[PDB]
């Protein structure tokens, strides 16, 4: 059982997450300026108040590019529930030494963006 | 800064019920905790959102806070008032909770929130 | 012998494979125990010959079993293995359930699957 | 299907090959349990292209007992390329139950050494 290091943004509008180029990456302060890029992945939840089904808000989780569910991805692959960022004069390699978060040992750092960054519309971190 | 919160995550009502937990069960697990301080109460917390242009009542949320902590750190065990109830385990103590106080969002995430062993929630409730 | 699955099976109809969060996820049991209250889903997967003569899967399924039971009865709890995921509800033992062990088609109807109340599940996936 | 060591390789520099202590050599994970702490190390050495062909230093890859491309191996089996390491407390059972690693949705943990563990010469982790 691994999890993102850091907790999550919510998704209130309708569409993807997306960073503009150059932000998006959570402040780690035990990482480096080489270890700043990675992905968000989308996490749906569905529960039961009685329509059968209903979706709640989407939940997106920052990994280190080359760990977590997606650690195979190379960064800039399209794929559905994967956006991309990176701080500039991060490296294109993957972060192995920051691996994933293991809950039984840690809690998840609170997601904090850096100074200036501007999150989409519809999107709140907790 | 001044930035107060629950040590736990919410539990939201989506049924017509109030909170309500039959005595003795009730207080999310938390295992930087003892058994004596297995006491306290959930508040309600109100919302509307904006469908759009629609000023869209949301479904309550409940959140839980240590006896003598939290929005209603004065009050003492079982007092009277609407939006609280409270939770506790048997062999828990009758004290304020200053020790475990309320939690930083700035600085610490949400524990989680998980009912012991055997508690079931009352319907039209889910965790979140 | 040859035997089944307690429950019915949820079936995927999303690209997200099976997951819970921690404490959730484990099928409604009254005549079972909160220290049984453990185990895993397992990835049955079909195949079908289409309308054109190929080979095509059908939508996977996936079965309930307690930890100890069924396929893999000897997987610890926790186990990676392609095809199961785990489900444990607070304070059930991560022991072996050979007492409930797996069902007889023959004398037992299968019960139908159903979820705590509150319980969240990936897009894909219906609880009934 | 075609899996990856969970960890990352210990590269052979010098011509030792590799050899433990009693007790020493099994790398640091702590999603794993005392019991799990056995298995072995296997070599894969690599070969590159003045037009001839080239070894490259052997890189040893450790993979739990029962898991690998020697999955079928018991403790202290004899075969080239393949050295043995237990911790004290462990079980000579198949470890299953960790396997080996998709590299899609899981990146590797660096491989690590507890403090105190001693190495034979030209091996490093890299
Ligand atoms: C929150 N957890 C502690 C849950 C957990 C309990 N017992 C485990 C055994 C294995 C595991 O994940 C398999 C694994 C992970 C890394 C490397 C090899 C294998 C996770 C767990």
Redesign the interface.
Known sequence: ??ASWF?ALTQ?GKEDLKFPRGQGVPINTNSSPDDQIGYYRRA??????DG?????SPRWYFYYL???????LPYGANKDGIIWVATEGALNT????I??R??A?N????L?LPQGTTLPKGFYA?
């Open positions: 059982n691994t907790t209130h749906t939840r569905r529960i039961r108040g059968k089904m209903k979706d709640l080359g760990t977590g569910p997606e650690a195979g993957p972060k192995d030494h691996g994933t293991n809950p040992n809690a998840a750092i609170v904090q907790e």
